[PDB]
Short mmCIF file of C-alpha atoms in Angstrom, two decimals:
data_model
loop_
_atom_site.label_atom_id
_atom_site.label_comp_id
_atom_site.label_asym_id
_atom_site.label_seq_id
_atom_site.Cartn_x
_atom_site.Cartn_y
_atom_site.Cartn_z
CA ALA B 1 -0.28 0.08 0.09
CA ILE B 2 1.22 3.64 -1.02
CA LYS B 3 1.04 6.60 1.78
CA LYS B 4 1.26 10.29 1.17
CA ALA B 5 4.44 12.30 2.37
CA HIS B 6 5.09 15.80 2.01
CA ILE B 7 7.49 16.72 -0.50
CA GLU B 8 9.64 19.08 1.62
CA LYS B 9 9.65 19.01 5.56
CA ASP B 10 12.21 18.59 8.34
CA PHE B 11 14.42 21.32 6.73
CA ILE B 12 16.73 24.18 8.29
CA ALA B 13 18.54 26.42 6.40
CA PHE B 14 21.34 28.86 8.66
CA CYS B 15 23.09 31.55 6.42
CA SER B 16 25.59 33.86 7.18
CA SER B 17 23.92 37.25 6.42
CA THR B 18 20.82 38.68 5.45
CA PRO B 19 19.70 39.13 1.57
CA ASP B 20 21.89 41.76 0.23
CA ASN B 21 24.58 42.02 2.91
CA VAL B 22 27.99 40.66 3.31
CA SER B 23 29.29 38.03 5.00
CA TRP B 24 32.53 38.50 6.96
CA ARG B 25 36.03 36.24 6.90
CA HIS B 26 39.11 36.77 8.63
CA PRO B 27 42.42 35.46 6.83
CA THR B 28 43.78 33.70 9.58
CA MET B 29 40.54 33.50 11.71
CA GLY B 30 38.32 32.39 9.31
CA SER B 31 34.58 32.76 8.72
CA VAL B 32 33.11 34.83 11.60
CA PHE B 33 29.74 33.06 11.23
CA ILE B 34 31.46 29.38 11.11
CA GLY B 35 33.59 30.34 13.96
CA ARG B 36 30.67 31.60 16.17
CA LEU B 37 28.25 28.38 15.07
CA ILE B 38 30.92 26.00 16.27
CA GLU B 39 31.48 28.05 19.59
CA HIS B 40 27.56 27.93 20.16
CA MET B 41 27.56 24.52 18.95
CA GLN B 42 30.30 23.25 21.42
CA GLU B 43 28.12 24.66 24.64
CA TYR B 44 24.59 24.71 23.74
CA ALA B 45 24.36 21.29 21.77
CA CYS B 46 23.92 19.66 25.05
CA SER B 47 20.61 21.64 26.62
CA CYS B 48 19.55 23.69 23.24
CA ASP B 49 17.59 22.40 19.77
CA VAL B 50 19.03 23.41 16.94
CA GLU B 51 16.52 26.18 16.40
CA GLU B 52 17.38 27.44 19.75
CA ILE B 53 21.17 27.84 19.08
CA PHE B 54 20.92 29.20 15.78
CA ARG B 55 18.66 32.20 17.68
CA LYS B 56 21.80 32.24 20.27
CA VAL B 57 24.26 32.66 17.41
CA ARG B 58 22.24 35.42 15.82
CA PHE B 59 21.74 37.47 19.30
CA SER B 60 25.83 36.92 19.56
CA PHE B 61 25.69 39.46 16.26
CA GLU B 62 23.07 41.75 17.77
CA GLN B 63 25.74 44.60 18.41
CA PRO B 64 26.93 45.88 15.21
CA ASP B 65 30.73 46.76 14.80
CA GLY B 66 32.76 47.59 11.57
CA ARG B 67 32.49 44.39 10.15
CA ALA B 68 28.75 43.95 10.75
CA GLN B 69 26.29 40.55 9.78
CA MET B 70 22.96 39.03 10.91
CA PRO B 71 22.55 35.70 10.18
CA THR B 72 19.17 34.38 8.91
CA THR B 73 17.30 31.09 9.55
CA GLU B 74 15.80 30.31 5.96
CA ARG B 75 13.09 28.13 4.94
CA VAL B 76 12.15 26.48 8.02
CA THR B 77 9.93 23.05 8.18
CA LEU B 78 11.16 21.82 11.36
CA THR B 79 7.92 19.78 13.03
CA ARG B 80 9.97 18.77 16.30
CA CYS B 81 12.73 20.17 18.32
CA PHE B 82 15.87 18.71 16.77
CA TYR B 83 18.44 18.17 19.59
CA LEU B 84 21.82 16.84 18.92
CA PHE B 85 22.02 14.90 22.29
CA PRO B 86 26.03 14.78 22.23
CA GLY B 87 27.14 11.90 23.67
CA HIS B 88 24.09 9.61 22.71
CA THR O 1 37.70 16.24 28.71
CA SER O 2 38.67 17.11 25.06
CA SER O 3 40.46 13.56 24.37
CA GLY O 4 37.10 11.77 23.62
CA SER O 5 35.30 11.69 20.48
CA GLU O 6 32.91 14.55 20.85
CA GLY O 7 36.23 16.71 21.68
CA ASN O 8 35.19 20.12 22.76
CA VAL O 9 31.72 19.86 22.43
CA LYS O 10 29.78 19.74 25.91
CA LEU O 11 28.22 16.31 26.85
CA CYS O 12 24.41 16.09 27.30
CA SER O 13 24.37 13.99 30.31
CA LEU O 14 21.78 11.20 31.46
CA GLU O 15 19.67 13.38 33.52
CA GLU O 16 20.14 16.25 31.35
CA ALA O 17 18.22 13.86 28.39
CA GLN O 18 15.62 12.83 30.78
CA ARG O 19 14.91 16.80 31.92
CA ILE O 20 14.62 17.33 27.62
CA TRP O 21 12.53 14.41 26.63
CA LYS O 22 10.12 14.90 30.16
CA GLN O 23 9.63 18.82 29.30
CA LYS O 24 8.58 18.33 25.87
CA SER O 25 6.28 15.21 25.01
CA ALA O 26 6.54 13.49 21.70
CA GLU O 27 7.87 17.14 20.14
CA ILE O 28 11.37 15.91 19.54
CA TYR O 29 13.17 14.39 16.40
CA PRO O 30 13.97 10.65 17.22
CA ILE O 31 18.10 9.40 17.50
CA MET O 32 18.80 6.10 16.25
CA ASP O 33 20.97 3.51 18.42
CA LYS O 34 24.66 5.04 18.30
CA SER O 35 25.91 1.37 17.91
CA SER O 36 24.31 0.94 14.57
CA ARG O 37 23.44 4.43 13.10
CA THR O 38 25.21 5.59 10.19
CA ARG O 39 25.28 9.74 10.39
CA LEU O 40 26.22 11.44 7.33
CA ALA O 41 27.74 14.96 6.51
CA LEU O 42 29.17 17.04 3.59
CA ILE O 43 30.93 20.03 3.53
CA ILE O 44 31.52 21.77 0.17
CA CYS O 45 34.32 24.49 0.56
CA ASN O 46 35.33 26.72 -2.25
CA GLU O 47 38.90 28.56 -1.65
CA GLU O 48 40.66 28.51 -4.85
CA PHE O 49 38.92 30.43 -8.12
CA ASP O 50 39.50 31.45 -11.43
CA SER O 51 38.47 34.78 -11.70
CA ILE O 52 37.48 35.84 -8.10
CA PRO O 53 39.49 36.41 -4.85
CA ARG O 54 41.26 33.71 -2.94
CA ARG O 55 39.34 32.91 0.17
CA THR O 56 42.06 32.82 2.79
CA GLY O 57 40.81 31.34 6.03
CA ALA O 58 38.86 28.75 4.85
CA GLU O 59 41.35 25.77 5.90
CA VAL O 60 40.22 27.15 9.45
CA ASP O 61 36.70 26.93 8.66
CA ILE O 62 37.07 23.61 6.90
CA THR O 63 39.17 21.84 10.00
CA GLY O 64 36.64 23.40 12.87
CA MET O 65 33.33 22.49 11.21
CA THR O 66 34.56 18.68 10.29
CA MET O 67 35.58 18.28 13.37
CA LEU O 68 32.58 19.79 14.82
CA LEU O 69 29.95 17.59 12.99
CA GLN O 70 32.58 14.75 13.82
CA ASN O 71 32.38 15.32 17.26
CA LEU O 72 28.47 15.49 16.70
CA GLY O 73 28.30 11.78 15.48
CA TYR O 74 28.62 12.45 11.61
CA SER O 75 30.94 11.17 9.07
CA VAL O 76 32.14 14.24 6.99
CA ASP O 77 32.83 14.35 3.42
CA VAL O 78 34.92 16.94 2.42
CA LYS O 79 34.93 18.22 -0.85
CA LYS O 80 36.42 21.35 -2.54
CA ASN O 81 36.82 23.95 -5.55
CA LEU O 82 33.87 23.04 -7.24
CA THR O 83 31.86 24.36 -9.98
CA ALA O 84 27.96 24.89 -9.45
CA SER O 85 27.55 22.12 -11.65
CA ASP O 86 30.33 20.13 -9.66
CA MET O 87 28.71 20.84 -6.62
CA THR O 88 24.77 19.45 -8.28
CA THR O 89 26.59 16.22 -9.23
CA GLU O 90 27.99 16.31 -5.47
CA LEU O 91 24.84 16.98 -3.72
CA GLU O 92 22.97 14.04 -6.19
CA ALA O 93 25.53 11.72 -5.21
CA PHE O 94 25.00 12.52 -1.70
CA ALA O 95 21.16 12.35 -1.51
CA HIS O 96 21.82 8.29 -3.16
CA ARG O 97 23.99 7.35 0.10
CA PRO O 98 22.85 4.39 1.53
CA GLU O 99 23.95 5.49 4.91
CA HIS O 100 20.65 7.67 5.14
CA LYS O 101 18.65 4.90 5.40
CA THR O 102 20.20 4.06 8.84
CA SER O 103 20.51 7.99 9.93
CA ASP O 104 18.60 9.94 11.77
CA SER O 105 19.55 13.38 10.52
CA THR O 106 21.86 15.49 7.91
CA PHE O 107 23.93 18.33 7.87
CA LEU O 108 25.42 20.13 4.75
CA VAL O 109 27.71 22.90 4.95
CA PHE O 110 28.48 25.25 1.90
CA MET O 111 31.32 28.10 1.81
CA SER O 112 31.85 29.81 -0.51
CA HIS O 113 32.05 33.62 -2.22
CA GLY O 114 28.45 34.41 -2.65
CA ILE O 115 25.94 36.98 -4.57
CA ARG O 116 22.30 37.22 -3.82
CA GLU O 117 21.12 35.22 -6.54
CA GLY O 118 22.85 32.29 -4.61
CA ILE O 119 26.86 30.52 -4.13
CA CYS O 120 29.56 30.80 -5.96
CA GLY O 121 31.13 28.30 -8.24
CA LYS O 122 34.97 28.00 -8.50
CA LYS O 123 34.40 29.34 -12.33
CA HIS O 124 32.31 32.35 -11.24
CA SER O 125 32.47 35.34 -12.65
CA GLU O 126 30.29 38.76 -13.60
CA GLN O 127 30.56 38.15 -17.28
CA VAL O 128 29.59 34.23 -17.05
CA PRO O 129 27.79 33.69 -13.86
CA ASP O 130 28.50 29.83 -11.93
CA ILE O 131 25.83 30.25 -9.36
CA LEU O 132 24.32 27.29 -6.98
CA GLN O 133 21.07 28.15 -5.78
CA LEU O 134 19.96 27.73 -2.49
CA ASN O 135 16.51 26.33 -3.92
CA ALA O 136 18.35 23.59 -5.64
CA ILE O 137 19.69 22.70 -2.66
CA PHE O 138 16.31 21.97 -1.02
CA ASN O 139 15.13 19.99 -4.30
CA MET O 140 17.72 18.05 -4.27
CA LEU O 141 17.69 16.80 -0.40
CA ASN O 142 13.55 16.52 -0.33
CA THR O 143 11.16 13.97 -0.23
CA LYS O 144 11.26 13.33 -4.03
CA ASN O 145 15.17 13.37 -4.75
CA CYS O 146 16.34 11.94 -1.34
CA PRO O 147 13.27 9.72 0.08
CA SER O 148 16.20 8.12 2.82
CA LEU O 149 15.98 11.45 4.69
CA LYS O 150 11.84 11.25 5.13
CA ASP O 151 11.09 12.90 8.49
CA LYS O 152 14.83 13.71 9.13
CA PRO O 153 16.56 16.50 10.17
CA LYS O 154 18.19 18.36 6.97
CA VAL O 155 20.25 21.44 8.43
CA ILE O 156 21.93 23.57 5.90
CA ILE O 157 24.66 25.71 6.49
CA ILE O 158 25.91 28.29 4.64
CA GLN O 159 28.76 30.74 4.74
CA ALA O 160 28.58 33.41 1.93
CA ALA O 161 27.86 37.30 1.35
CA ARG O 162 24.40 37.54 -0.03
CA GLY O 163 25.46 41.10 -2.10
CA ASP O 164 27.72 43.96 -1.68
CA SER O 165 25.97 45.88 1.28
CA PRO O 166 27.36 46.50 4.29
CA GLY O 167 24.15 45.38 6.02
CA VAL O 168 24.08 48.59 8.71
CA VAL O 169 21.93 51.93 8.69
CA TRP O 170 22.93 55.00 11.21
CA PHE O 171 20.54 56.06 14.17
CA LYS O 172 21.22 58.71 16.49
CA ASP O 173 20.96 58.17 20.25
CA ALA G 1 26.44 60.99 17.78
CA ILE G 2 25.30 58.51 15.77
CA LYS G 3 25.54 54.49 15.88
CA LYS G 4 25.19 51.49 13.76
CA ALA G 5 22.27 49.42 13.29
CA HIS G 6 21.16 46.33 11.51
CA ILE G 7 19.24 47.37 8.48
CA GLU G 8 17.55 43.85 8.83
CA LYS G 9 16.66 42.32 12.04
CA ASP G 10 13.79 41.18 14.48
CA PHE G 11 11.53 39.86 11.82
CA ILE G 12 9.65 36.53 11.28
CA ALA G 13 7.72 35.27 8.18
CA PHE G 14 5.44 32.26 8.33
CA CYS G 15 3.92 31.31 5.11
CA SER G 16 0.76 28.72 4.43
CA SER G 17 3.03 26.50 2.62
CA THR G 18 6.55 25.46 0.93
CA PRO G 19 7.57 26.94 -2.12
CA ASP G 20 6.02 25.63 -5.16
CA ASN G 21 3.14 24.21 -3.48
CA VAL G 22 -0.65 25.19 -2.88
CA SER G 23 -2.43 26.26 0.23
CA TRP G 24 -5.79 25.28 0.89
CA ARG G 25 -9.17 27.21 1.59
CA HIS G 26 -12.77 26.17 2.49
CA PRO G 27 -15.58 28.12 1.03
CA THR G 28 -17.39 28.07 4.70
CA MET G 29 -14.38 27.43 6.76
CA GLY G 30 -11.98 29.67 5.51
CA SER G 31 -8.50 29.13 4.89
CA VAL G 32 -6.99 26.14 6.99
CA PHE G 33 -3.40 27.87 7.73
CA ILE G 34 -5.31 30.38 8.99
CA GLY G 35 -7.65 28.63 11.10
CA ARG G 36 -4.69 26.40 12.32
CA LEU G 37 -2.68 29.56 13.28
CA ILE G 38 -5.45 31.22 15.34
CA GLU G 39 -6.45 27.85 17.10
CA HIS G 40 -2.87 27.31 18.01
CA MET G 41 -2.21 31.40 19.14
CA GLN G 42 -5.47 30.89 21.46
CA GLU G 43 -3.49 28.05 23.13
CA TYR G 44 -0.46 28.36 23.36
CA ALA G 45 0.48 32.36 23.39
CA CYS G 46 0.33 32.20 27.50
CA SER G 47 3.12 29.78 27.04
CA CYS G 48 5.28 29.57 24.09
CA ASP G 49 7.30 32.12 21.95
CA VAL G 50 6.19 32.66 18.52
CA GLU G 51 8.88 30.65 16.91
CA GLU G 52 7.66 27.57 19.03
CA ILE G 53 3.89 27.91 18.59
CA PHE G 54 4.74 28.04 14.55
CA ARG G 55 6.59 25.19 14.98
CA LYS G 56 3.63 23.78 16.72
CA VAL G 57 1.53 24.83 13.95
CA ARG G 58 3.62 23.00 11.33
CA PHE G 59 3.37 20.02 13.19
CA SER G 60 -0.31 19.99 13.22
CA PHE G 61 -0.29 19.63 9.33
CA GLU G 62 2.54 16.92 9.57
CA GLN G 63 -0.01 14.02 8.65
CA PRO G 64 -1.39 14.69 5.01
CA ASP G 65 -4.64 14.26 3.56
CA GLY G 66 -6.29 14.89 0.49
CA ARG G 67 -5.56 18.52 1.14
CA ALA G 68 -1.91 18.54 2.23
CA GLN G 69 0.18 21.68 3.02
CA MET G 70 3.60 22.33 4.97
CA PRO G 71 3.39 25.85 6.46
CA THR G 72 7.19 27.49 5.90
CA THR G 73 9.13 29.92 8.47
CA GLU G 74 10.78 32.17 6.39
CA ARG G 75 13.96 34.76 6.55
CA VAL G 76 14.13 34.63 10.48
CA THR G 77 16.18 37.18 12.17
CA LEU G 78 14.67 37.29 15.80
CA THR G 79 17.15 37.66 18.33
CA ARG G 80 15.30 36.84 21.28
CA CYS G 81 12.04 34.90 21.92
CA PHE G 82 9.22 36.87 21.33
CA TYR G 83 6.60 36.22 24.17
CA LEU G 84 2.92 38.03 23.28
CA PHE G 85 2.34 37.90 27.49
CA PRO G 86 -1.82 37.55 26.91
CA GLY G 87 -3.15 39.36 29.60
CA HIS G 88 -0.50 41.91 30.08
CA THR F 1 -14.24 34.23 30.19
CA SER F 2 -14.02 34.86 26.83
CA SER F 3 -15.88 38.14 27.72
CA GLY F 4 -12.69 40.08 28.35
CA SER F 5 -10.29 41.88 25.59
CA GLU F 6 -8.35 38.84 25.28
CA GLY F 7 -11.37 36.94 24.42
CA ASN F 8 -10.54 33.14 23.44
CA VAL F 9 -6.95 33.28 23.90
CA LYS F 10 -5.48 31.72 27.14
CA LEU F 11 -4.26 34.27 29.94
CA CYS F 12 -0.72 34.25 30.51
CA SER F 13 -0.67 34.55 34.39
CA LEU F 14 1.84 36.65 36.86
CA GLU F 15 2.83 33.25 37.98
CA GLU F 16 3.60 31.93 34.45
CA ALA F 17 4.98 35.17 33.13
CA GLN F 18 7.92 35.42 36.11
CA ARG F 19 8.59 31.45 35.08
CA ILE F 20 9.17 32.37 31.44
CA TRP F 21 11.14 35.74 32.99
CA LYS F 22 13.28 33.02 35.43
CA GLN F 23 14.12 30.27 33.07
CA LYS F 24 15.76 32.70 29.72
CA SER F 25 17.75 35.39 31.06
CA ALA F 26 18.16 38.33 28.75
CA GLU F 27 17.00 36.53 25.38
CA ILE F 28 13.29 38.05 25.31
CA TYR F 29 11.80 41.02 23.75
CA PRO F 30 11.01 43.47 26.06
CA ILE F 31 6.71 44.70 26.36
CA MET F 32 5.95 48.22 26.82
CA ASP F 33 3.79 49.22 29.59
CA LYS F 34 -0.15 48.08 28.92
CA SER F 35 -1.65 51.63 29.78
CA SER F 36 0.73 53.58 27.56
CA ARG F 37 1.65 51.51 24.26
CA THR F 38 0.06 51.83 20.97
CA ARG F 39 0.40 48.31 19.04
CA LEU F 40 -0.76 48.06 15.38
CA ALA F 41 -1.32 45.41 13.09
CA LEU F 42 -2.07 45.53 9.50
CA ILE F 43 -4.24 42.80 7.46
CA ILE F 44 -4.21 43.14 3.55
CA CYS F 45 -6.96 40.91 2.01
CA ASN F 46 -7.70 40.24 -1.15
CA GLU F 47 -11.13 38.64 -2.35
CA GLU F 48 -12.53 40.12 -5.37
CA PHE F 49 -10.42 40.05 -8.31
CA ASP F 50 -10.38 40.90 -11.91
CA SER F 51 -9.56 37.84 -13.73
CA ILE F 52 -8.80 35.49 -11.39
CA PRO F 53 -11.56 32.97 -8.80
CA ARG F 54 -13.27 34.91 -5.83
CA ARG F 55 -11.56 33.63 -2.79
CA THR F 56 -14.67 32.29 -0.81
CA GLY F 57 -14.13 31.99 2.68
CA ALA F 58 -12.18 34.80 3.07
CA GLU F 59 -14.37 36.83 5.43
CA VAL F 60 -14.18 34.01 8.02
CA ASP F 61 -10.11 34.75 7.87
CA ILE F 62 -10.69 38.46 8.14
CA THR F 63 -12.75 38.11 11.14
CA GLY F 64 -10.58 35.30 12.76
CA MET F 65 -7.51 37.20 12.55
CA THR F 66 -8.84 40.69 13.30
CA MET F 67 -10.47 39.40 16.40
CA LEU F 68 -7.14 37.53 17.41
CA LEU F 69 -4.80 40.45 16.37
CA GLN F 70 -6.88 42.61 18.81
CA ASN F 71 -6.87 39.85 21.91
CA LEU F 72 -3.41 40.33 21.47
CA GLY F 73 -3.46 44.32 21.88
CA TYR F 74 -3.09 45.26 18.62
CA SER F 75 -4.93 48.16 16.80
CA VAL F 76 -6.11 46.47 13.36
CA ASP F 77 -6.46 48.07 10.19
CA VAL F 78 -7.93 46.22 7.29
CA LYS F 79 -7.50 46.75 3.90
CA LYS F 80 -8.83 44.66 0.99
CA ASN F 81 -8.81 44.17 -2.84
CA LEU F 82 -5.64 46.10 -3.25
CA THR F 83 -3.53 45.91 -6.68
CA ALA F 84 0.50 45.61 -5.72
CA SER F 85 0.92 49.10 -6.36
CA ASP F 86 -1.95 49.69 -3.67
CA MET F 87 -0.06 47.33 -1.06
CA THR F 88 3.25 49.11 -1.18
CA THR F 89 1.51 52.55 -0.81
CA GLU F 90 -0.56 50.96 2.16
CA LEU F 91 2.65 49.40 3.54
CA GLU F 92 4.75 52.22 3.11
CA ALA F 93 1.86 54.26 4.72
CA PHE F 94 1.92 51.47 7.99
CA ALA F 95 5.58 51.90 8.13
CA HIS F 96 5.28 55.85 9.00
CA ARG F 97 2.81 56.02 11.67
CA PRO F 98 3.56 57.56 14.66
CA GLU F 99 2.27 54.52 17.13
CA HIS F 100 5.34 52.37 15.93
CA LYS F 101 7.55 54.58 18.21
CA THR F 102 5.36 53.58 21.39
CA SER F 103 5.22 50.25 20.30
CA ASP F 104 6.86 47.12 20.98
CA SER F 105 5.88 45.09 18.08
CA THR F 106 3.63 44.14 14.66
CA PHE F 107 1.72 41.97 12.96
CA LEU F 108 1.46 41.99 9.24
CA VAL F 109 -1.06 39.73 7.52
CA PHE F 110 -1.25 39.16 3.89
CA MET F 111 -3.89 36.91 2.46
CA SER F 112 -4.76 36.31 -1.46
CA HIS F 113 -4.16 33.87 -4.40
CA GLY F 114 -0.56 33.41 -4.85
CA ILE F 115 1.94 31.85 -7.38
CA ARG F 116 5.90 31.18 -6.79
CA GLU F 117 6.99 34.66 -7.41
CA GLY F 118 4.79 36.32 -4.75
CA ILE F 119 1.33 37.53 -3.68
CA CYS F 120 -1.45 38.42 -6.21
CA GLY F 121 -2.67 41.98 -6.66
CA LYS F 122 -6.59 42.52 -7.32
CA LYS F 123 -5.60 42.90 -11.27
CA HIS F 124 -3.29 39.72 -11.54
CA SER F 125 -3.34 37.88 -14.67
CA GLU F 126 -1.12 35.42 -16.62
CA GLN F 127 -0.52 37.85 -19.11
CA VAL F 128 -0.55 40.62 -17.00
CA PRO F 129 1.14 39.62 -13.63
CA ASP F 130 0.33 42.11 -10.43
CA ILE F 131 2.51 40.74 -7.88
CA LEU F 132 4.05 41.37 -4.19
CA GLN F 133 6.92 39.97 -3.28
CA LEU F 134 7.82 39.02 0.08
CA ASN F 135 11.25 40.76 -0.55
CA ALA F 136 9.46 44.13 -0.80
CA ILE F 137 7.59 43.50 2.03
CA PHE F 138 10.74 43.00 4.37
CA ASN F 139 12.31 45.98 2.72
CA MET F 140 9.53 48.15 3.39
CA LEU F 141 9.59 47.28 7.25
CA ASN F 142 13.15 47.05 7.79
CA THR F 143 15.21 49.61 9.78
CA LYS F 144 16.37 51.88 6.92
CA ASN F 145 12.57 52.23 5.79
CA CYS F 146 10.61 51.89 9.12
CA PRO F 147 13.28 53.01 12.01
CA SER F 148 10.18 53.12 14.48
CA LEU F 149 10.25 49.07 14.59
CA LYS F 150 14.21 49.18 14.77
CA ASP F 151 14.62 46.22 17.88
CA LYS F 152 11.05 45.11 17.66
CA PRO F 153 9.69 41.98 16.43
CA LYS F 154 7.87 42.28 12.84
CA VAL F 155 5.47 39.26 12.42
CA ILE F 156 4.65 38.96 8.91
CA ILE F 157 1.52 35.96 8.02
CA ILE F 158 1.06 35.13 4.63
CA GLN F 159 -1.73 32.82 3.62
CA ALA F 160 -0.85 32.10 -0.57
CA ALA F 161 -0.64 29.43 -2.32
CA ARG F 162 3.27 29.51 -3.65
CA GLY F 163 2.56 27.27 -6.95
CA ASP F 164 0.33 24.82 -8.28
CA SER F 165 1.89 21.31 -7.04
CA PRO F 166 0.04 19.57 -4.10
CA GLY F 167 3.12 19.22 -1.93
CA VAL F 168 3.08 15.12 -1.80
CA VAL F 169 4.71 12.07 -2.87
CA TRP F 170 4.26 8.58 -2.40
CA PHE F 171 5.81 5.96 -0.38
CA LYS F 172 5.18 2.16 0.68
CA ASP F 173 5.06 1.27 3.86
#
């Protein structure tokens, strides 16, 4: 027997900046979005779901400096909380 | 200790895991058994280009993301300096991997130069564009083109500019 | 004195379906996405932030029928949790 | 009781509000004083069209959303049967409203026929498209074009199809 499934579901995209806008990278330190994402994933994977972690990453960028950017979550069809359960 | 498989990623304890499973009912994605699951992740990073500036520091990004995804339990494929056509071919191959059947989730990481329209391939120039669109990434990984990842979280991470603007406006206090 | 601010921040969009796909409406019952959104906002505004409520709305659509759709959250730059605090 | 200003919306108690403020630190958007705040919301709904089918049931949507947003504390403007040009004019006027200065948030609701590209205006046809893009909505409400809503949540709700496809694939159990 056949059953119907949503063609597009359980996706989340996380982009380094808002549309039209630059994303910054340091020659020795790497991309700031990437570095910031790793730091937050290392700290918060144990206690927060991915949507929550991405929000925290966005917050860390809130105060703009000389190299400003605002990471954006896109086209979200996560129907549940995605916890990484690091160690499990 | 950072000497374990999870490295610098803070561990979720048994009491912490049960707290997560108690606060939320049936609103969490199920994770497969650690002993049998075959988690896959793909990193595509473009550093060396034909006509646009070299992405110095990209190696730091590759190292950081590869180690992180491994720490989280994913087997990581790293592909470098691809055209948009090559990225499409690589994504199609990734969607066809048998391991997704015995996996509970996946991560896709794209790192390159970017414009408003999408992500730059190695051959990109203003005269002859070489762009992979975010829409194409979703399409290649959806239920039609990747049935093995049905009901499973698919996380797409993109490091790339989305235009030329500084992303700021002025205001007075 | 002047200070820098992100051009685009604190946005959340919620669409009735995924790209390429139809959104359903009943001649007397109205649009299903709208009706479902109201029901979830009425029930969960007191306890959940907007991102969480929208996720719950998505979950309610998880099992597809003859008229299927999957609401999608788009272009999110919320840096904090947005609680409506109904009654306050 | 549903006889209060919040109607059928379940109330957040004082103990429930303090629980929210304790579990999360400085990660919640501040709400302005109930006595002085001037919250605004805008609903644009297209029901009657020149060349495409009438949206029967739209009145139920207008009623439901208007009452809900009022229940949540917003003063609701309802605009009906507009072209894409009219919607742009209406959005520009909304962004210029002085009340946003003494508000903590806003809701924008769009309800119409839709295609992949965006939201249909009243004059829309396949031959002569009349479309408002989601990108334009964001642009008109951002910090550059709406400085009064800087740092404040802007929630955009769109009821509209995004193409012709049924949104489903088959699988066997």
